[PDB]
Write a protein that binds this ligand. Sequence first.
Ligand SMILES: [Zn+2]
Lengths: 50, 147, 34, 183, 104
Amino acid sequence: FLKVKGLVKQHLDSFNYFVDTDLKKIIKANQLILSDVDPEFYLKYVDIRV
Amino acid sequence: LSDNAKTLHSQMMSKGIGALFTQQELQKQMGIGSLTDLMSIVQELLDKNLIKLVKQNDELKFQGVLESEAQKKATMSAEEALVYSYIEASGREGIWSKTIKARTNLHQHVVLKCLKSLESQRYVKSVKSVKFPTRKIYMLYSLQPSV
Amino acid sequence: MLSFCPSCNNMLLITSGDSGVYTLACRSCPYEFP
Amino acid sequence: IEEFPLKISGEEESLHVFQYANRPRLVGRKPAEHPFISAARYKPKSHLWEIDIPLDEQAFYNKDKAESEWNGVNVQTLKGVGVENNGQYAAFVKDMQVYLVPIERVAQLKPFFKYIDDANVTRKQEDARRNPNPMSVKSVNDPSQNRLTGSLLAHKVADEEANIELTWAEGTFEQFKDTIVKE
Amino acid sequence: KEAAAELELLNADHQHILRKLKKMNNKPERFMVFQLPTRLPVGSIRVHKSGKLSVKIGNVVMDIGKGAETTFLQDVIALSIADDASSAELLGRVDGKIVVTPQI
Ligand SMILES: [Zn+2]
């Protein structure tokens, strides 16, 4: 049980859940910043990687 | 189609601009068609942006305006003529520039860039009012300094 | 006090009736009883 | 040992089930009757079922309290919101046959007090006309502003929509053999 | 202990519903509603050894569990609608309600 699942189980397995999956769920919740002046300008984020 | 719209606005311009018209006398006046297609040419006349919809309190009211100011406002774009409607709605006591921004949601740059062109079109002047000094007050050239 | 009023289930209320009689009747439902 | 085969024969028909939150089943072990529907009321896109019931007369009525306050008489109406779920098949049996059909919505009928709602809408209207104390050009969608949506928008579309006046009937044999002839 | 008080009542629940499906054979415009499990991975109500009930609505998929369980003091009435028209028909009221449970 401790060979494949060590002693720092809670610290690393949350940060490894952060960098892979949890960042895509944040750019998809703050995408498409817009400017009301000159309304045909848009910056949207397609993905994110570390 | 067009000729039915040509009859109704001649009735709108028939009377002197006061005595603001409504539907309850309009169907008495122009009731050759049913209400289903009467509205459809008036909404098309709203698409021809001549008729406006004025308000006497708590109820539905209409008002026709002249063709002379309709042509000059058709030269403007969407947002250009939109802000020109607010000043002409005020008319007599002017309107404050910051309150115009509140009724549009257009922020400070796009409203000031619009009226910079609009003064060169000679439709709007700036007066100095005294019940609140040092505020931007706009009117037409029709000159009501009642304050 | 288990004062269920039929067809509304709301309540009952002791009403000061005509000549001060103690009839029972709820509001918000046309129901009465001596 | 034995077997009772069943088949499902139901399409195209969205049959509904009402639930009387007032009326019990049995009165001393004997079940009572279901009351006589005077008329119905339905609105699409919000799926309300406004069922009207009429009352008994002067013996248990107290009319001089009813006439003098609201003037809306002999009508108890009740509202039920139709809700959707999966499964919930309705079945009738034949001799050694049993046939099923899916139920599309289920409503739960609560007593919608029509007139006391209607009693105060006149009371506010007269209050305005005692002391009445006294203009629309387009606006722009802004990306730093919110607009009303969600659950209260459903109440904005459940207030003004087309009623349908139902003719309440009692059939029950036309649909019965319609399932029998279909395999 | 208290696990045995469950099975004897479900044993008695077979007989209370086998009587009810027998009295209801006279089709007097009577109805009952019951819920079938969706999400399939038609059949036949059967009687097993000494009165046990099961259905096999799949080609192989067996559903042992059935039980008449809900207590309700309400008058429920099945009625049809059609296309927002003159289609209000009261068919009948509902006597009981059973369930269907796939065994695991
Ligand atoms: Zn009551």
